[PDB]
């Protein structure tokens, strides 16, 4: 599964706190990506692995 969401809000929360991000909000939903390649993301200066 690739990294997907239902809003920009959950994406910009996923970069905020990786260990405490809410995978399921009220109606929206976000999927953290598991993959053989652990691709790195840059949204300004906050980064996750």
């Amino acid at each position: 599964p690739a990294l997907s969401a239902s809003s920009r809000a959950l994406i910009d929360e996923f970069m905020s706190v990786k260990q405490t991000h809410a995978p399921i909000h009220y109606g929206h939903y976000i999927i953290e990506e598991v993959a053989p390649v652990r691709r790195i993301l840059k949204f300004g200066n906050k980064v996750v692995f």
Binding site: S4, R8, I11, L41, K42, F43
Partner: protein
């Protein structure tokens, strides 16, 4: 790391091809099935003429 979007407009190039809208392939598959349904149904199949 570009935040792309996937709305229905990108889906429109697949959800509007008539191959997705024809039942001829799935009915050709189901009629050519070696073991069809065990039970059938009779009520409200078609419209009967008064």
């Amino acid at each position: 790391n570009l935040l792309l979007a996937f709305n229905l407009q990108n889906a429109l190039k697949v959800l509007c091809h008539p191959r997705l809208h024809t039942p001829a392939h799935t009915l050709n598959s189901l009629n050519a099935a070696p073991a069809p349904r065990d039970r059938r149904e009779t009520y409200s199949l078609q419209h009967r003429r008064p």
